[PDB]
Amino acid sequence: EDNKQFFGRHRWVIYTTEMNGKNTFWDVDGSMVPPEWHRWLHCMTDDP
Amino acid sequence: LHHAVIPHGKGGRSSVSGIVATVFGATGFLGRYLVNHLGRMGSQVIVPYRCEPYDTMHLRPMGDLGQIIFMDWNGRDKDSIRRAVEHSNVVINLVGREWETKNFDFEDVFVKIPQAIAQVSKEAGVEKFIHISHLNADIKSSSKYLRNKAVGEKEVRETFPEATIIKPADIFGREDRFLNYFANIRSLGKKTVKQPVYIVDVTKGIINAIKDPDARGKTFAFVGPNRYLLFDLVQYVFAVAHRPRDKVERIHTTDRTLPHLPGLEDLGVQATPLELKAIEVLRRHRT
Amino acid sequence: TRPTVRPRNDVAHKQLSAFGEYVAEILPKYVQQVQVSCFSELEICIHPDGVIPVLTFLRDHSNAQFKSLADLTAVDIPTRQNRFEIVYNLLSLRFNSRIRVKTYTDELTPVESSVSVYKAANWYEREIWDMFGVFFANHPDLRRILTDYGFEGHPFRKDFPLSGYVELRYDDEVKRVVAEPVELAQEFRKFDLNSPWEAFPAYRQPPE
Amino acid sequence: TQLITVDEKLDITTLTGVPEEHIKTRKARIFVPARNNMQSGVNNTKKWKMEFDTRERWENPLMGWASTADPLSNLVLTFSTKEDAIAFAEKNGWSYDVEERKVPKPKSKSYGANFSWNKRTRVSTK
Amino acid sequence: ASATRLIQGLRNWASGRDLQAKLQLRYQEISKRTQPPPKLPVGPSHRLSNNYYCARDGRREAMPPSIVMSSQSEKKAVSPAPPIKRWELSQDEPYL
Amino acid sequence: KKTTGLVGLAVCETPHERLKILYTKILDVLGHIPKNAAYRKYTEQITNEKLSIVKAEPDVKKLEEQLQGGQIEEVILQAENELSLARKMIQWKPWEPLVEEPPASQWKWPI
Amino acid sequence: HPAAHGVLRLVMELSGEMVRKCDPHIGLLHRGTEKLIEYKTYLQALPYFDRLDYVSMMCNEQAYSLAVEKLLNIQPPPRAQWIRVLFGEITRLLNHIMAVTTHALDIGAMTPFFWMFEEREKMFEFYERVSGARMHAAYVRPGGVHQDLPLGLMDDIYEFSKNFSLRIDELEEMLTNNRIWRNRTVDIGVVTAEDALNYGFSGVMLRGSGIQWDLRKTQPYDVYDQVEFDVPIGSRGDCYDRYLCRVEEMRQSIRIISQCLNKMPPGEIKVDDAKVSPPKRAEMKTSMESLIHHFKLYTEGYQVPPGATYTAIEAPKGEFGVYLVSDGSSRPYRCKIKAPGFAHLAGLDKMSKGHMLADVVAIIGTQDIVFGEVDR
Amino acid sequence: TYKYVNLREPSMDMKSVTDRAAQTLLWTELIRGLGMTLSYLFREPATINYPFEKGPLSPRFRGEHALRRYPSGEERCIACKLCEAVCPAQAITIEAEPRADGSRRTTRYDIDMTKCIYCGFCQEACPVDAIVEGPNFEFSTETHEELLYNKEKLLNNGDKWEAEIAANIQADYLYR
Amino acid sequence: TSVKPIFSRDMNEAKRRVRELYRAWYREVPNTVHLFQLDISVKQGRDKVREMFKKNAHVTDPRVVDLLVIKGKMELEETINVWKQRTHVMRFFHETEAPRPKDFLSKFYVGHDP
Amino acid sequence: GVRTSPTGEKVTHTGQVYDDEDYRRVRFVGRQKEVNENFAIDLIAEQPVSQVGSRVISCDGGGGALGHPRVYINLDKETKTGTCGYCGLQFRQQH
Ligand SMILES: NC(=O)C1=CN([C@@H]2O[C@H](COP(=O)(O)OP(=O)(O)OC[C@H]3O[C@@H](n4cnc5c(N)ncnc54)[C@H](OP(=O)(O)O)[C@@H]3O)[C@@H](O)[C@H]2O)C=CC1
Ligand code: SF4
Ligand code: SF4
């Protein structure tokens, strides 16, 4: 999360490779986030 | 017998009928019209596809909500075929390719496929198994295709006694092979008798046999109501279409009647001639 | 009383009462009921043989202009010899008042087709023909709008049930979209909710 | 303009579009709806409801729902008298049954009768 | 923005509306969430000791509509309403 | 004036005398209409008072202050329309008593 | 595709690059709205009035809730009236900016559509913070507004007001002073006042062609009588003139939002009646009668006294009318909708009697159609 | 108050007519339009790189249709059928039986995700707050078979997360 | 009982207008089977047209016959225009069964058809 | 607590598991049946029997306005524990 960027480009997620053994270096999906960071990432709060 | 198998009221569109039908092939032509008439009847249809899911995606939505079901299969093993006949009331063998490929000739489709599925069908407890074949496919000459279908008829007659061996003549429709081959050529003519029968008469007969008991074991053969000359037929096709190699031996050689075994009216469905439906279906001429 | 109760103004009530008795004085040939609700809008209940005279009067005459037309719906009340009700809903431009001409009719006898005097009435009339079935004599154009061309039944009656008799699906046997009788996936479970104990006391009809 | 008018029947059933199967095959039932007996109030009375006799309701095998091929089995009309009910049933074509109204009978009760001397009408508990 | 002077000068020169001020990339009024728990007040209800519901019984006050004539020299002809006054050109920059 | 506020309403060059002969035609055609009907009396009252509004003023702005129908020709157009309904109402005889009664179990609501 | 902007099956019979006549065959978007509301209750069939016009997401809710309140004899509380007025003005702003931008995309004019849709995305975010829905926020129950706004919203609307005044003045910079766009819509769309009053036109046509008329000024159905604004009037009955009418109504909606925020009272959310509005959660979980009224209010539906009513609001299309017919029950007996889009589509021949096909595209573009409302 | 538009006149002065003539013959206002569009060119566009930057929301969104359960306990529903009574497309279907204890419970609890129109009436209506409109909106389903949720689907969808749901409810139980 | 009928005065105008409408349908069908590129012979279409006339044969009232003339006139106008499509003309026919006969035996095996 | 069915399919918390004459088995082909893994019956014995010494006590459910409405249960049975209908957890009295 940066504070020099605006509302929408605040927070972003970078996924790792083979998080469930599925060769996810490519083709990143939605809902590859755990739900607490899913609360954090939609700007539903101001706390990690 | 068990509940959710008994019929319910009217027919079609989640009006549940009795049969649970496992249909082989069906990505081609006759299986597609048969799946359509079962969805009009409204039953649960298990179709295995080895092919792309996209072809069965385009022939998919004819079933109602969760009615048809998909699985995968091959012509090598028995595990996927047993998975196809885990629970199946009736099952039909509609398989075949009209030209030899690398991995499969005319041999071993007609030999290798019905052996395994007839074996596992007699084992795994199905009823009223229906096998198609071609008309007048004998041990006689000029067709490796037709002698291989005679070999397959021998096997399906020998093992699994309680079948329905059935055979139509050359059938014509919207995605016909040989009638489109007649329209898409380039050409010569002899004297050769031939009876064609429209495809929905055949599939009405098939579904009437698939829901009718106590006519089983009797093999059937289908009858064209005209049964006239090949060269007159090519003239009529070119006339309605406005324009002036194992397959070509099969179409030139012979198509005869066989009075030994029953046909359409012994089952009770009206035959429709070539000319009416040919005016109906011969689009795609000039302009 | 004073909070959270929408207060009425008796000025509009008295003025519309005087205007209603005035209309009943000056057109005695067709007037049956002139009723005023608590929220002060005029309702004039009329026989269906003076539609053209009443509208040709109420468009002009300089005591009430009423140029503007709106809703026409022939609200289907059964248990009557005349089922349907044509409701013209007229609005002034100088005076800020709303009048509802409720004229009655049945399923078959035509009303006089107001399109000659109110030009807005054309598609309103075509809609009422296509949904109800009130024919409009001496009218130029009666076609079907809001329903299918191969469709019949006048679906906004009470006698047309909520589902349809026809339902479309595609089939490849004839390569087209064909119509079949209805085979639903779920019942539309209708819940009885006419609860007793008479939730309004002032509207008790006289019993026998 | 002093037109034809003659006293005959009405045959809207050829206009309303509903097919002959539902014209001849079902049977209307017209009745005053009885009180839902657990509650005690008669606002749900004082009408004349018309219903249709139900038909087959099978089980949807995918969810256990009730799929029905019955378009008319969920219509119910509210009328004000029996004669308009009969007139509408003959006008709109189909057959009908008349289950006649059965009002509650008036009776006579008094607490002084509940506390009699030789008569056996006695509550014996209150 | 957050950039150099030449391109910001070309932005102001292509439209002189002070582009750096109101630029539609907000950084500051992102609303500070996890607010304190708000108490929702209630006005002229739930006050004890006088709230007879029969007093403010607004549903029951709907009278059936009053009926004037049926089928079952008086100096008159008023309108349904007074004639509505002609308006005025507003002061807030009219035309013309 | 010059180019009034409406669209399909071109300005008038003779307000007064055109409207005066209009209202004399209104009273004339109303004079053909029978007597005991209320319609003759109310039309007579409103038309004579509107004409006496006009005959007492040679103005335009004070005419708009005193008489409604803003601005000017709308009174003329509504006058022509009331003349049109008068010409219709020589026919149709609306003061005659009622055409036949309702079936009397109809207009009362609660069904 | 696009020259319907949706679906209208146009049948134009024409002598060449001209006309003879035309019929808009409409009703392809028929959905059975009045029938479905006839088989439902009031509170359950509220979303049909949310989406029979599918753009004005709050105005038609306001119209239905005012019909129920007008029949039911309940004044809504003051703060609910002010929130309803604020979102009426926001909804008017959204609907007029969609009308201008879809006129532009129908006529060509790619990018100003996109500038103003980024602004409309901001306003969708505000609706989401209020209710949760992207577009079809129900949110306006009968008897005042339900589930009032969370803490921290008015400052955001203030910031949007400043940014949006600058952006709409840059849209006037872009489009209004254009040569060929003016040449594109001046010659067409004459509307005589006779035609405007007989053919049943409503709203922006009546403003843009002659007659001084506004429901907000004439018959204030709520607290509109306490703010300073002034509706634009047309000059010649022209689509350039009507475009100017729509842009200045956007500007006056900005002024009404500004004055409404600077005169906002913090009263209360819903009515003082637990027989129409549901009791809230605290008294629900700790009362008895609140749980009773919650349970029967959501199962049975509140009863509505018998009677026939009609009302109309000033939706951004025009005189949006709703006509209720209530048997004494908890289900409305018959509802019907006066659609300004339908009455405007009725005058299609008289607007385009002597013109060509691109003029017909401009005639459909210059009147805010949704055709979900032309159907009913 | 009325403020009409388009009432000017062309001033026949030499200055005004030569300004309008320069406007005509010199393409000035078209260059002005190009200037406005390039003034929006040299800005920074407000896009978001989607699968890395999800969009903003509210704490009162309507998504997933989860169920809840008591703290260290069993299910929170009762089968009180209010949600089937208030579902405005009647997608809710509840068949209820009591189990071997005696406390009332269910057998079958169905939402049609096709017919669900995402009001929140079953969010406002449920007295124990058993059904909650879930937080996330990613359904993206291949077949029509999957979109008919069961009760065990909703329990395993409420077991997939509650910390989100509990945090949002504790954020916003005071308004609704 | 005051009734003002639509067009006729007795059934003589009813017979006149219905024979005119049948003449219109008889000469309008081969144009449509040329235009819509159908699959049906001309005499089969004409026979089902006269079948649709014969279906409503048991109607006596003049108003109902006049209203049927109105309905048929409206649909003949919408078929001589090209406003309808191949779906609608095939919807008038029946080439999608609906196979259930009127036998009591078949209505006994197929459930619950009295 | 799944049951070793002859089919081998997982049972549910409700006794709805199939037979050998069911084709809904063959519509479960290749698609793994999602059953609830944490049941609802056995999660009562996991919770201890609370002991509140008073006679008629009050149950809310873990916090105000998050849970079930106030239910005032009685404990007068000498051998049967109390049971809130909403909660499901028991109560006993302490003399
Ligand atoms: N006149 C006629 O057309 C006659 C037809 N028949 C029978 O009718 C049926 C349909 O006719 P037609 O169109 O010519 O045949 P098709 O090829 O269209 O139908 C056979 C289907 O089974 C598939 N299939 C066949 N062999 C194999 C294999 N070894 N492995 C995997 N898939 C296989 C085919 O291709 P894919 O694998 O790509 O799905 C196709 O889906 C056939 O069974 C044919 O024997 C019989 C007599 C006359
Ligand atoms: S409203 Fe809540 S408690 Fe009632 S049945 Fe629905 S989910 Fe269960
Ligand atoms: S949100 Fe969905 S499940 Fe809930 S009431 Fe609305 S349509 Fe029904």
Ligand SMILES: [Zn+2]
């Ligand atoms: Zn408890």
